[PDB]
Amino acid sequence: VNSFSGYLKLTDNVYIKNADIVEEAKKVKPTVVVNAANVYLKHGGGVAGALNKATNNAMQVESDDYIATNGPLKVGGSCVLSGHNLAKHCLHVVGPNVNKGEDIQLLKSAYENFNQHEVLLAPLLSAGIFGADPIHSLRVCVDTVRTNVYLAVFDKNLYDKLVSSFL
Numbered sequence: 001v002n003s004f005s006g007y008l009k010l011t012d013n014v015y016i017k018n019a020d021i022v023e024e025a026k027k028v029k030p031t032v033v034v035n036a037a038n039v040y041l042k043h044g045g046g047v048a049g050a051l052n053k054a055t056n057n058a059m060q061v062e063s064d065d066y067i068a069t070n071g072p073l074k075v076g077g078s079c080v081l082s083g084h085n086l087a088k089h090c091l092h093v094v095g096p097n098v099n100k101g102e103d104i105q106l107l108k109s110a111y112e113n114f115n116q117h118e119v120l121l122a123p124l125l126s127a128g129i130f131g132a133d134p135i136h137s138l139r140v141c142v143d144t145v146r147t148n149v150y151l152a153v154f155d156k157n158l159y160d161k162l163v164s165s166f167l
């Protein structure tokens with residue numbers, strides 16, 4: 001048993017809900033929230049900007065120290081940092097940004113990072129302003145993640161399209 005509520009069950013291990021990731025995290029206080037990060041951990045918009053804003057910029061302060069010590073992440077890679085007031089941990093995962101010209105094949109590699117955690121609250125990686133097809137991202141998630149993942153889709157119209165098109 002876990003604290004997640006109001007989810008559509010997609011498969012054995014993947015669940016989905018129409019929710020803003022910030023509101024959904026503050027309610028559950030999951031062990032792990034996934035951030036849709038970039039390699040520089042510059043949390044400007046999308047999921048990253050919203051989560052960071054909810055931490056009063058503490059996520060960005062922690063992230064800048066991480067980058068100063070370690071350098072940038074890889075596209076497809078991740079790091080575990082604090083979840084601040086949103087979760088125990090934040091898993092910062094870099095999916096390919098189609099609007100940066102990055103290879104979409106790296107989306108599977110990005111989702112593989114989720115398998116290092118038994119349960120996660122997460123957005124759809126590489127969707128929204130990262131420019132990939134959300135239907136595709138959901139399919140890659142289902143076909144890659146084996147641990148228990150609770151997906152949040154904020155756009156209602158997108159949520160409706162994802163449910164009705166899911167095989």
Ligand SMILES: Cc1nc(Cn2cnc3c(N)nc(N)nc32)cs1
Nearest residue numbers: 020021036046047123128152153154
């Ligand atoms: C770069 C990416 N953007 C998304 C979509 N997206 C944007 N803002 C939110 C938000 N507040 N909550 C949720 N669940 N998804 C969001 C997914 S990856």
